[PDB]
Write a protein that binds this ligand. Structure first.
Ligand SMILES: CCCCCCCC(=O)OC[C@H](COP(=O)(O)O[C@@H]1[C@H](O)[C@H](O)[C@@H](OP(=O)(O)O)[C@H](OP(=O)(O)O)[C@H]1O)OC(=O)CCCCCCC
Ligand SMILES: CCCCCCCC(=O)OC[C@H](COP(=O)(O)O[C@@H]1[C@H](O)[C@H](O)[C@@H](OP(=O)(O)O)[C@H](OP(=O)(O)O)[C@H]1O)OC(=O)CCCCCCC
Ligand SMILES: CCCCCCCC(=O)OC[C@H](COP(=O)(O)O[C@@H]1[C@H](O)[C@H](O)[C@@H](OP(=O)(O)O)[C@H](OP(=O)(O)O)[C@H]1O)OC(=O)CCCCCCC
Lengths: 475, 475, 475, 475
């Protein structure tokens, strides 16, 4: 520390002592405070426009399941099937007879498409199709079965009449069938213009009823899918952009203020790297050996590496959100994560504002001392925790529904050590008590030892590691 | 401490040492003990009269949903709707045909109103009305839509016959409709006079059936509302006030005894302010600087500021409860909070009676040392906790019902760190596993990191702060 | 300690040092070990005979609800009612037509009673009765109502024919009715003689169908009750007492061995009282003042006061269980508590056998040091906990079902601080969000402050009191 | 320690110091690392072939309950019964009429058996049978009942016609019947050859419909059972073993590599026993007395005793899994436990690899110091915990369903101290509030004292034992 006491001990510095040494107003500091009030308000004005366009989308799918499926009651979306050979005829014919008489029984003013796509012809609106094996003759107890898997697509085409036969002659070959699908499209007008007070959207659905039979087990599940394709509709109206000028000028400010904060925060990371040369350069190997890949990262502080990354995640989400004016992108799964994960990192930066206080620093710096010791112990438990996942998946696998796959076993074993759906899993074991009573005896040894290891001892380590790292900050 | 050792060290004083110095019987202390046995008994005699008048009110609404709605089974109050154009005709006509034949199928002896209100005429009892746009012609794929929002109120009036046509000619214009409401009123006699043994009340309901269609999505929810308007009914009977003299003389005692305790407790706050002049006045800036806005509030003790406020909340609730004899106020939401929040503060004052013991003081004064350190750490977590609310609301928003609004996200994320409805949220993510499988991967990173931060570390700080503030009271 | 070092320091004594001083085999100690293996085996042989006689009793009530009630589906035992005036005629007539044709549609071989009781005549088996007000004429909007409460009992009597009219002329006066009940009895033969291999029991039920209308709110709940009256049936068979001699000789051993242990344990309490005279008698007020109501109870040890009481509870339950041979007592609610609470106290006496070990004593004597400090703090919380019960019962009372009475509020507030039915209570508040939106704002302040007081601080005191009383046993 | 400092202090040795003394590459150590990647991949390739063969098995049983049972809706598998004498005729006849017309209404191409088993004749496919008492005449109120238990098996035989009467004359004797069963078998072809691309399996079911009446209580539960008998089906096809050569050569590697690791790990246990002779042999009773059955087990380390046992459990599960090629064994309950429990012990051996680090050893060796003290305290609680099981089973036994047997009481009392199904048990007590109101008062003393003993104190001992054993590893 020969020459640069004025400069190297100005880098390591509390921001409240900036006024005493030289003094300049915090135009560097309060720029990040603006980012709190600019990014959050962007998300609320976008999140309330996404909430409106889903509660209309998911309430046409419910209205499509009652008009197009035979005997649909609420709550049954997985147990709804067809078990006889005459219920599958009555489910296909009811889905078409309600399509050929749609604007006389349904309310909402839907209209047909006269489609010209790939699973349609030149003048069709409905296309029910079959898939089955091209050559097959199976018979149990006379075991000459021949399988050549090649799907045969025998589509049936019918058009909708509006202003005032060849599908009833349908054969399915039930010992050969794979699945029967139904394709049609409907256009509607979103009449939710109370909040917009301007031109609303014009939607175009795509309903897919699937009579899937892949298990070949005498059970055909029936479902319904939609893909709400959204674009503008050609209006003869005028002056839409009187209210459109209140939302697009606000989104380019985020492109500015997060990138204007990307200029200043990254430059502070350049200034921290030039002072690495000034420090070890004049320390000309004086204390033997200086750099051991730990003294270089002292200049690199963990808060500027967070705001630089949070500016990249924000600027990659604002460009995608501009694709709502007229652009033909339909991907809200990517656009919402890039805005959502960035907003998670913007808010946790306020802890740095709470860091420079002498009474909050004790409550935070224990989470930097214990953060190695907690994460070290999490590797001694995630070896044990992966042990009970493979043992429960193959023994309690055929008999129970909760223990079926490792995406579901690791959710039912992790919710059971925190105290939820516990007696439901014990009471489900006793439905197989008389049925193969040795599995029930192993399911009592499995569900008593796993629950009394991660609650009574392993959960009690995480209490003792924080308290053991709380006495070492003031004693 | 020159002159007032007899007086300033009589203010700071344990109440059990009052007898030794001068000595007077505790007519100041035991007045608050009477307030325990006067306010609580007021609430139980009022709470058991409110319980009787609601279990009659909410069991006529259930009886109105079965008589007036077509196909109403229990448990369905949100999934009950109408999806075709003929089920809405059969739901309006069944609600009127059971109104024009009400005293021949229903038990309970209801009677009509012959109403003279604002949505009625001079001689009507039932008024079904429409609302629709005044000028509209929408059509998808021929996109000339014109909207001028102005509700048109085409009410239909019909009267009930009792002693031994123009509504069947109803058209709704389903591509233009907003909502269809139904207004009528019924009067009944509360025959629950077992506990009263005197004149009971006479009610007048107001049933509102709402065929609301605001989403314009092919789904019309059906509901029913009541506002039980309550006043007396003109009796030719005599001597009601033989049992009425057991409840109104007891309520003016609370007006006395809480205000007589407002005279003595506030005067003790005046006496604590005059001794502020006697203390710092004769300390004529002797130790440099005395008052720094912390030494003034030493005279202000936190228990007399609580009982003064609890007397204002009580006296503002006793005046409102007098409006049950003959007054025409109908507001129980304000009257019950003013009594309920006051009773919460009366009971916690008993801790002051448990404060002056040498074995309970250790168990309470740790909650005054740790109360800063817990509340400081709650500000370092409510910044993180508001981070995960915005990230979960826009990503897991369209796909799930629990994560729909911040009034519901902050209830499902807070119940998940205490161990409830945990596996229900994990099993609801896997219904969208094949459907857009990148959201499911983010919902595993979101629901494993949020749950292992506020249970394994942050919940383990609150254990270490109490223990760290429990060793500093006896070591 | 002058004279009785041989005797007073033989009273205070570990039982493993009994062999070294004088020496006698533990016929005093191992008598209590026999009580472990005699009382527990009595309960299992009695508990498995009570389990068999209830699963037959509660599976005739389910079979009676399907044969005698119109439209009874499972799961609905509180929502089952009758809302129109014609459904109450069809529910009474179906309960009688299935009684007059019972042995032709029902399986089980039930038989009639030809009853001679108090609500019957000389030759009747079925008695449907009415109760209504003797003088009443109520009318809303012409408010001259007169009430004279006196029940009029107009019973209708009909007899069952078996070997090959005046009830159809029934009028109920629905604006005057109170309730309509139905009384009959059936006799059956318990054919579950697989485990008995001797004469089984012969039952006589009593079915009570109640069309109760006390609310007068247009809703009549329908229910069914049974009282299975049990005695012997007059058999011409012989040699029942070949298997009866395996269960009554085993129950008089408990009358002996618990009372033979009442002779020795109470005599040890007499011997502890005579040595109180020998101790303070020769201490002739030597150290000033000796007895201060704490030194007398040093001789009284807390384990012999437990086994004496556990012998009284056992001997009062064995006498009652003898009333199953031929005695006409029917009270299993008293007999099972006297056996159950006694068995709870027999098992916790084994801790005394684990007390005399130098490695288990540390784990138990912390529960005698902390047991004052935990119970002192439980009085500082049960004052706060009773505060939130009265505030939640009157504000969240009319709007919600869980917060209806203090027998239910104190179960829903206590299960919410341990982590169960938490999000169910938050999601039930938002069904009244638009309906009177100030109650919903108070229900967020009520259900966030109560849950973050008894989990984050008050639950963290009980961890700090045990740890603070665990360092004071070895440091 | 005279002669063998080179040898006895080479046994006690960290494996990272093996290179410094003599030096050889870890072919002993990394063999166990191969066992991680060989046993786990064996379980995933076997677990995904068991998952496919169960989701076909349990989706034919659902398809059999809708085709063969009258009025079967989903969710009712215990409440489905028959209560009148005409519903049992309509349930037997519907199960046969859908069997004699099975290949005309059902999809899946099932075929009959023409069975030649023990409950069949020479040319039958369906066998409905009766069981009843051979001599019985019971009558209540004329109490001459005679019972001679001997089952009479009156089977009725009928054959299925395919290419284009004596069962309708059936009498059941309902006052004498025991149960009515139905036996038939069906063969189907598993058409799930997408993942196999070769010859699939050929199944043969066995459906058992049971009209069991053992309670004789007017309720006959109806159920359905299957035993999917699996073997090959005689194919005229060729070249199945092109894909079969990818799974059987991988399973004999586990037979090698776990037994090749059984040669080296057991030899290390032989070498630890020869050095017991070298240690105490040259210590010729020098320090008085050496071996006290604690110094012998110092050579026996707890990790080699675990891998030897885990090799026996693995080699006993690989031999059983070979019985899937052509062997006629059908026992997956034994084969999955021998693989599952072995895989649990393979994964926990990785803790030994995390043991030899100076920062993970503190987090693990506390679980060897506290493991006595936790297990000692678990014996002082499992005496109390067995006390509340017998007290709750006989008092809350007849009235409630959750407290019915000790296999269910010990699951509902253990899930209640961890915070699950808590308010469900409190709300179930209040359904018997008016009915025998002294049991309800005892159920509040029972469910408030048991829950505030094992959460507020006993759960707080396990936190204080870990923290008390964490300060004794670094202070
Ligand atoms: C005369 C008009 C009517 C007044 C009738 C008065 C009848 C009588 O005998 O006087 C008592 C009076 C004390 O009452 P005083 O008016 O001062 O009131 C004090 C005041 O209420 C404090 O807040 C009380 O403390 P705490 O909240 O309880 O902790 C305290 O209660 P307690 O100590 O009373 O328990 C009181 O001292 O004496 C004196 O004034 C001091 C000596 C000067 C002599 C004054 C002689 C009157
Ligand atoms: C004679 C009538 C029948 C009595 C048959 C008696 C047969 C015989 O051999 O006498 C033993 C008797 C001791 O029994 P004793 O009647 O005093 O009974 C004592 C009493 O039961 C204590 O409560 C026991 O303590 P603990 O709850 O176990 O902790 C203790 O048990 P234990 O120490 O026995 O284990 C007993 O000392 O001796 C003496 O009286 C003292 C010497 C005076 C000589 C008396 C000679 C009889
Ligand atoms: C010749 C027959 C085939 C044998 C081929 C042998 C090829 C060769 O180079 O010999 C090595 C052999 C050591 O192997 P050795 O048979 O004694 O086996 C030891 C044994 O397996 C221990 O349990 C191992 O400890 P750990 O579980 O790992 O902790 C240890 O492993 P490692 O130390 O090996 O890693 C072994 O020492 O040397 C000696 O015998 C001692 C010197 C005497 C000279 C002996 C010269 C052969």
């Amino acid at each position: 520390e020969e020459d640069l006491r004025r400069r190297l001990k100005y880098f390591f510095m509390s921001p409240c002592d900036k006024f005493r040494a030289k003094g300049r107003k915090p135009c560097k500091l309060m720029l990040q405070v603006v980012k709190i009030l600019v990014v959050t308000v962007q998300l609320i004005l976008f999140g309330l426009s996404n909430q409106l366009a889903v509660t209309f989308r998911e309430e046409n799918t419910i209205a499509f399941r009652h008009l197009f499926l035979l005997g649909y009651s609420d709550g049954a979306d997985d147990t709804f099937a067809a078990y006889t050979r005459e219920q599958l005829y009555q489910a296909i014919f009811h889905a078409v007879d309600q399509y050929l008489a749609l604007p006389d029984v349904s309310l909402g003013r839907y209209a047909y498409v006269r489609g010209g796509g790939d699973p349609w012809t030149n003048g069709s609106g409905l296309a029910l199709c079959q898939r089955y094996y091209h050559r097959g003759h199976v018979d149990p107890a006379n075991d000459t079965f021949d399988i050549d898997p090649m799907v045969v697509t025998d589509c049936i085409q019918v058009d909708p009449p509006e202003r005032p036969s060849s599908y009833k002659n349908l054969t399915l070959k039930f010992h050969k069938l794979v699945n029967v699908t139904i394709h049609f499209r409907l256009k509607t007008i979103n009449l939710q213009s109370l909040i917009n007070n301007e031109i609303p959207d014009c939607y175009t659905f795509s309903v897919l009823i699937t009579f899937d039979n892949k298990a070949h087990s005498g059970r055909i599940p029936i479902s319904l899918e939609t893909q709400a394709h959204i674009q503008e509709c050609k209006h003869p109206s005028v002056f839409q952009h009187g209210d459109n000028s209140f939302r697009l000028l606000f989104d380019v400010v985020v492109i500015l203020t997060c990138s204007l904060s990307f200029l200043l925060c990254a430059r502070s990371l350049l200034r921290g790297f030039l002072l690495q040369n000034e420090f070890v350069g004049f320390m000309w190997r004086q204390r033997g050996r200086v750099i051991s890949l730990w003294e270089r990262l002292e200049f690199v502080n963990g808060w500027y590496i967070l705001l630089v990354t949070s500016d990249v995640l924000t600027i990659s989400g604002t460009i995608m959100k501009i694709g709502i004016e007229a652009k033909n992108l339909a991907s809200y799964d990517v656009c919402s994560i890039l805005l959502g994960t960035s907003t998670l990192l913007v808010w946790v930066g306020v802890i740095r504002y709470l860091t420079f206080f002498h009474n909050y620093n004790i409550l935070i710096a224990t989470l930097r001392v214990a953060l190695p010791s907690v994460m070290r112990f999490c590797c001694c438990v995630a070896v044990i925790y992966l042990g009970y996942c493979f043992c429960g998946w193959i023994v309690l696998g055929p008999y129970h529904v909760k223990f079926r796959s490792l995406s579901m076993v690791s959710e039912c074993l992790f919710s059971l050590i925190n105290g939820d759906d516990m007696f439901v899993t014990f009471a489900a074991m006793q439905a197989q008590q008389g049925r193969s009573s040795l599995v029930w005896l192993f399911s009592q040894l499995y569900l008593y030892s796993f629950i009394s290891l991660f609650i009574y001892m392993v959960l009690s380590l995480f209490i003792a590691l924080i308290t053991g790292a709380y006495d070492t900050i003031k004693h």
